[PDB]
Amino acid sequence: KKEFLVPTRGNITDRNDEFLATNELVFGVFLPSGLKQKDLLEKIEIIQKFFPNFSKETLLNNYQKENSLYNHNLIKVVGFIPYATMQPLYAKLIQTQGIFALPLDKRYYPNNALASHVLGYVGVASLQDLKDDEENQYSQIVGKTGIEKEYNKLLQGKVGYKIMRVNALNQELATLEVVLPSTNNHLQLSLDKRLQKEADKLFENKRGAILVMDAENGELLVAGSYPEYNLNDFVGGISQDKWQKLQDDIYNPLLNRFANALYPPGSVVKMGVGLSFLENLHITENTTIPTPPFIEVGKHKFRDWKKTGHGNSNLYKAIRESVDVYFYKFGLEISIEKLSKTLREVGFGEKTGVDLPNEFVGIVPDNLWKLKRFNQDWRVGDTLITAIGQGSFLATPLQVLAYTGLIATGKLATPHFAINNKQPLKDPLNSFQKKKLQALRVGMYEVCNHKDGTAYHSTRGSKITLACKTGTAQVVRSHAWITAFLPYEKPKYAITILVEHGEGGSKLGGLLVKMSNKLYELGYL
């Protein structure tokens, strides 16, 4: 009756205990390391006769990896046999000289690509990891991206292993007992597997990102970066080829588009700019100015999204019909310092503070930044391009999401996955600003619900009342934003949707409606 230190790792579940990440128990077949080239092939022969399956080439190959996840110092793993298969042939395989069968509780992702950039994958700990370590983290198995890395310590458990017993008695079958577990390491995410699937359906041929947040605390119900990758491909430690084809896909599936990609926010920053206008200028939301197809400054002319122009327009209307010239005009009057302050406040400067390694911060172009990095001081027209969320203005979908959350509720939520991060709501806006958000919400409600709103024909057939804002980002065909909260009458959720080359905002409303309806259908509303 032999016992084994079986390497295991914690479970990752969705907000309803549905398994996002877990383990399956197998046997690894191992050979002694530093083995003679003549022995090796001979012992490989015996293994494939036991398990007529394994390709003589892939066993040799396996034995020769220099980044195996489960290798010992003096024995190397050549293959992964299911318990069903190993059971009958354990004893005779033990009996053969120089061959070992060791239980391994390896990673298994049941839903494959689902939430791949959220969950992330386990891998062999590298030399640059080890050389940089400041916490006596000497484990060969560690998380490499997303949650796996973020909570590696929690998920790895106390020592990284559990103790199992195998009884290949006089009997002809191997039983398997767990004598000591590795407990206190289940992690529970706020995701809803069911919603994440609807998100996966919505982006079936598309590229970009989608987030659905509880704006009262930060819980991310959905978080997709499309295209996703199939986490299982990384389980034994990624196949050198399988790695290539993930790196060479021109759609770039390794990138996290919701946390680690930048984009101009475009028209979506209009509420925030408008807030700055109200703070800093002798204006109310109801102040009405004329808004031709264009105005000019000196050398250049600044054009409205469409050439008809809009006639007269106040802030409600500007938001409603995404009027570029309103913002160009008052952009002339506002100070970039006072603008960029407003923008930073509502989130666009720094990180949202999400449970993922290396969240990206964007760029809020101000005047102290043009002088430092470049040389000339800030020109007036530069404000105007920033006022409509383009030029050197870059942001993540999370920043847009969090901004939307702030506009909806008055307080900045910290988007997170891990359910047990009490993430207290931050309050960056003052009483006057919170008061003035009221206008902005009505604005956003008009975009979705007033017949001239840009997303009116877009967002029809919605169970719950939506307040939304569409945008486009120019490319460094145009990226399309839609960002929203619901219900309008009493806001709880925020949704942010980015499609690369979706082009507009009145294709995306259909997606907002779809996800919004799937929420009501599953009783979140």
Numbering used by the authors: 45 to 520, 540 to 588
What does the study report here?
Penicillin-binding proteins (PBPs) catalyze the two last reactions in PG biosynthesis (GlcNAc-MurNAc polymerization and stem peptide cross-linking, or transpeptidation). Class A enzymes can catalyze both reactions, while class B PBPs act uniquely as transpeptidases. Within the elongasome of a variety of bacteria including E. coli, Caulobacter crescentus, Bacillus subtilis, and Helicobacter pylori, PBPs have been shown to interact with, and be recruited by, the essential protein MreC, a bitopic membrane protein that is essential for cell shape. PBP2 (residues L38–L588, thus lacking the TM helix) is a 588-residue molecule that presents the characteristic fold of class B PBPs, with an elongated N-terminal region followed by a transpeptidase domain that carries the stem peptide cross-linking site.
The transpeptidase domain harbors the active site with the three conserved motifs: S–X–X–K (Ser311′–Val312′–Val313′–Lys314′), which includes the catalytic serine, located at the N-terminus of α2; S–X–N/D (Ser366′–Val367′–Asp368′), which lies between α4 and α5; and K–T/S–G (Lys513′–Thr514′–Gly515′), located at the C-terminus of β3 (PBP2 numbering indicated with a prime symbol). It is of note that a disulfide bond lies in the proximity of the active site, linking β3 to α9; a similar positioning for a disulfide bond in SpoVD (PBP2) from B. subtilis was recently linked to regulation of catalytic activity. Notably, in the crystal structure of unbound, closed PBP2, hydrophobic zipper residues Phe71′, Tyr127′, and Tyr134′ are covered by the anchor region, indicating that binding to MreC requires uncovering of this apolar patch through the swaying movement. A structure-based sequence comparison of class B PBPs from rod-like bacteria using the closed form of H. pylori PBP2 indicates that residues that line the head/anchor interface display clear similarities among class B enzymes. In addition, in structures of unbound class B PBPs from both Gram-positive and Gram-negative bacteria, analogous hydrophobic patches are covered by their respective anchor regions. In order to further characterize the “opening” mechanism of the N-terminal region of PBP2, we generated a “disulfide locked” form of PBP2 by engineering two cysteine residues at sites Tyr134′ and Ala218′, predicted to be well-positioned to form a disulfide bond. This mutant was unable to bind MreC in conditions where wild-type PBP2 could generate a stable complex in gel filtration.
